[PDB]
Design an enzyme around this catalytic site. Structure first.
Site, PDB file in Angstrom:
ATOM      1  CG  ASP A 171       9.971  40.913 -10.766  1.00  0.00           C
ATOM      2  OD1 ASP A 171       9.623  39.864 -10.131  1.00  0.00           O
ATOM      3  OD2 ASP A 171      10.553  41.888 -10.236  1.00  0.00           O
ATOM      4  CG  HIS A 202       2.106  38.163 -14.825  1.00  0.00           C
ATOM      5  ND1 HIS A 202       1.158  38.731 -15.672  1.00  0.00           N
ATOM      6  CD2 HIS A 202       2.911  39.165 -14.412  1.00  0.00           C
ATOM      7  CE1 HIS A 202       1.391  40.040 -15.747  1.00  0.00           C
ATOM      8  NE2 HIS A 202       2.448  40.328 -14.988  1.00  0.00           N
TER       9      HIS A 202
END
Length: 233
Positions: A171, A202
């Site tokens: 995360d 990400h």
């Protein structure tokens, strides 16, 4: 930044510009690059340059043209990051797929085109890449840490051409998807390939990102290039 004068017409008459990189040698496959939430900015220009340096031509369409043409936000500036999140929240995914479809058709027909078209998308563009793969508009699609992919798993059987997705296991700002759900879902269709980067979340591909992980960026980039190379003549 966009290439002055380039105008691509979409399904409903909406027109949008694009940043275009002609190939070092013609004919070459054309890669449509699907932007992240910052628009067609410095990282998108870097991606166009990268693919040109790797033997492709590249087209990065202004997907924010339906809301604010020419948006190119600096991810290091807090106010521009807040504008990126606002644009993303109001973004029309189905219209984005349609604009990408038009950019793919544009790409197939350029004078430098070998006829093959690939798509590479980052985050917002990585979710779009999956949607485009489900419609079958391109020869090969790649999505880097596509946001919201887990929710589109019912579309897995619709993918009829190869699509590769690089998933961040950690995360970061946006949470990571379930490794279990994605693995099981994508596993049903051998045209889908997925890799997990357990030491990255990400945004790992952009050097200046707080989420940049050199090892993940490089290995993902190597696989993307290996995955796109069959498009070359």
């Amino acid at each position: 930044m966009l290439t002055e004068g380039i105008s691509i017409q979409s399904y409903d008459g909406h027109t949008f510009g694009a940043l275009v990189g002609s190939p070092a040698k013609a004919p070459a496959p054309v890669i449509v690059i699907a932007q992240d939430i910052f628009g067609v900015n410095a990282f998108m220009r870097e991606t166009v340059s990268w693919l040109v340096d790797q033997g492709y031509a590249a087209v990065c369409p202004d997907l924010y043209a339906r809301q604010a043409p020419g948006t190119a936000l600096d991810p290091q500036d807090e106010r521009q990051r807040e504008q990126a999140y606002k644009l993303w929240q109001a973004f029309d995914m189905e219209a984005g797929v349609g604009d990408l479809e038009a950019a793919i058709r544009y790409a197939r027909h350029q004078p430098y085109s070998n006829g093959k078209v690939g798509l590479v998308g980052y985050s917002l563009g990585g979710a779009l890449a999956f949607l485009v793969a489900s419609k079958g508009y391109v020869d090969r699609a790649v999505g880097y840490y596509g946001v919201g992919l887990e929710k589109q798993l019912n579309k897995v059987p619709e993918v009829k051409h190869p699509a590769l997705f690089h998933m961040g296991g950690q995360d970061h700002f946006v949470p990571a998807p379930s490794r279990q759900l994605i693995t099981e879902g994508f596993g049903a269709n051998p045209l889908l390939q997925v890799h997990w980067y357990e030491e990255a979340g990400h945004s790992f591909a952009r050097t200046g990102s707080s989420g940049y992980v050199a090892s993940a960026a490089a290995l993902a980039n190597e696989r993307t290039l290996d995955f796109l190379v069959p498009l070359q003549s």
